[PDB]
């Protein structure tokens, strides 16, 4: 027990569609050669989700129509796909902690 929980703890920011979709979104520059889904839900997760990302302080940002399209075509553990790519970027860069 504790994967998701850990999971969400070092995410990079998390996009949601209100009370629905969680989609959390890790990238770490020389680990993971693109932004990866490591955990996604929806309804009862989704908002557990939320919850943890509270917890942690990871960003969230709303964004209904992203949050459907990767919900729909980028699972759990895959890397994003090129459609997604600047749309994701544009979400890491007004997430990253700049650490000052």
Same mark, same amino acid.
């Given at each position: 027990?504790?994967? &998701? +929980?850990?999971? %969400?703890?070092?995410?990079?920011? %998390?996009?949601? +569609?209100?009370?629905? #979709?969680? =989609?959390? &979104?890790?990238?770490?520059?020389?680990?993971?050669?693109?932004?990866?889904?490591?955990?996604?839900?929806?309804?009862?997760?989704?908002?557990?989700?939320?919850? &943890? $990302?509270?917890?942690?302080? #990871?960003?969230?940002?709303?964004?209904?129509?992203?949050?459907?399209?990767?919900?729909?075509? %980028?699972?759990?553990?895959?890397?994003?796909?090129?459609?997604?790519?600047?749309?994701? $970027?544009?979400? =890491?860069? #007004? $997430? #990253?902690? &700049?650490?000052?």
């Amino acid at each position: 027990s504790g994967s &998701l +929980a850990n999971n %969400i703890k070092k995410s990079t920011v %998390i996009v949601k +569609a209100p009370t629905h #979709i969680a =989609i959390c &979104l890790y990238y770490k520059l020389g680990e993971t050669p693109l932004p990866l889904v490591i955990e996604t839900g929806k309804d009862a997760k989704a908002l557990q989700i939320i919850k &943890l $990302a509270e917890l942690y302080d #990871i960003p969230v940002i709303e964004d209904i129509p992203l949050a459907r399209s990767l919900y729909k075509n %980028i699972h759990k553990g895959q890397y994003i796909t090129e459609d997604f790519f600047e749309p994701v $970027a544009q979400l =890491i860069r #007004i $997430a #990253i902690d &700049l650490d000052y």
